[PDB]
């Protein structure tokens, strides 16, 4: 996942509130998520990949190996089982909890890192560029 390594800053967000509503995120948390201007910092050390999200409002970090299930507490405070794979050159994360699932796809497109979050056909698109 060398293509993904770096510090990325948010440049656009589309349909994020509706996505969060579909997942079940509370009103106040959606408000915070909507106004935050996060950086996404991706690094690799051998077979261990780390993805950090940082803003004045919230900091999250996951460290994982491709294709190995791990436990995660999400930014919106869900406890999920996550599996991340490299699928068509994209990093694809599936989160499962309470019999539900959502997919977060991170892809490289030109100079952009495009993040697509989908649940039950509701999709948010958040685009990042190098900081
Ligand atoms: C279902 O809930 C989510 O998808 C939440 S809550 C949240 C928060 C940030 C700060 C407080 S809560 C961020 C996200 N998600 C993305 O932020 C996912 C895409 C990204 O990395 O840009």
UniProtKB/Swiss-Prot annotation:
Forms a beta-barrel structure that accommodates the hydrophobic ligand in its interior. It comes from the Eukaryota. It comes from Mus musculus. Changing residue 91 to A: Abolishes export from nucleus. The modification Phosphotyrosine is found at residue 19. Signal peptide: none annotated. A motif (Nuclear localization signal) lies at residues 21-31. Gene3D superfamilies: 2.40.128.20. Transmembrane segments: none annotated. It holds the Pfam family Lipocalin. Monomer. Homodimer. Interacts with PPARG. The modification Phosphoserine is found at residue 12. One of its GO terms (biological process) is long-chain fatty acid transport. This is Fatty acid-binding protein, adipocyte. The keyword Isomerase does not apply. The modification N-acetylcysteine is found at residue 1. Changing residue 66 to A: Abolishes export from nucleus.
């Amino acid at each position: 996942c060398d293509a993904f390594v770096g510090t990325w800053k948010l440049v656009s967000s589309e349909n994020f509130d509706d996505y969060m509503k579909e997942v079940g995120v509370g009103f106040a948390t959606r408000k915070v998520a909507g106004m935050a201007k996060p950086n996404m910092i991706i690094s690799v050390n051998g077979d261990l990949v780390t993805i950090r999200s940082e803003s004045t409002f919230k900091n999250t970090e996951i460290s994982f190996k491709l294709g190995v299930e791990f436990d995660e507490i999400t930014a919106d405070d869900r406890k999920v089982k996550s599996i991340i794979t490299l699928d068509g050159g994209a990093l694809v994360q599936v989160q499962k909890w309470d019999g539900k699932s959502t997919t977060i796809k991170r892809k490289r497109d030109g100079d952009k890192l495009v993040v697509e979050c989908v649940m039950k056909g509701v999709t948010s698109t958040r685009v990042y560029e190098r900081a």
